Amino acid sequence: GSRGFRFXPKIIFNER
């Protein structure tokens, strides 16, 4: 689902 997660100074996709 989601399209980007706040992971440090970078944004990545995780949970659908």
XYZ file of N, CA and C in Angstrom, residues 2-16:
45
model
N 1.288 1.647 1.187
C 2.126 2.825 1.346
C 3.157 2.906 0.225
N 3.684 4.106 -0.003
C 4.678 4.308 -1.050
C 5.825 5.175 -0.540
N 6.414 4.771 0.580
C 7.523 5.518 1.160
C 7.438 5.531 2.682
N 8.564 5.247 3.332
C 8.618 5.229 4.790
C 9.779 6.081 5.290
N 9.542 6.830 6.360
C 10.579 7.683 6.922
C 11.651 6.838 7.606
N 12.684 6.485 6.846
C 13.777 5.679 7.367
C 15.094 6.455 7.264
N 15.446 7.215 8.272
C 16.703 8.014 8.248
C 16.607 9.151 7.230
N 17.710 9.606 6.695
C 17.705 10.701 5.693
C 17.319 10.189 4.308
N 16.616 9.058 4.280
C 16.180 8.467 3.018
C 14.748 7.955 3.139
N 14.048 7.902 2.008
C 12.667 7.427 1.983
C 12.556 6.178 1.113
N 12.008 5.108 1.684
C 11.860 3.855 0.944
C 10.494 3.227 1.198
N 10.078 2.351 0.287
C 8.800 1.676 0.409
C 8.961 0.364 1.172
N 7.973 0.035 1.998
C 8.023 -1.196 2.779
C 6.667 -1.897 2.776
N 5.897 -1.693 3.840
C 4.582 -2.312 3.951
C 3.741 -2.014 2.716
N 3.102 -3.048 2.176
C 2.266 -2.884 0.993
C 1.421 -1.620 1.112
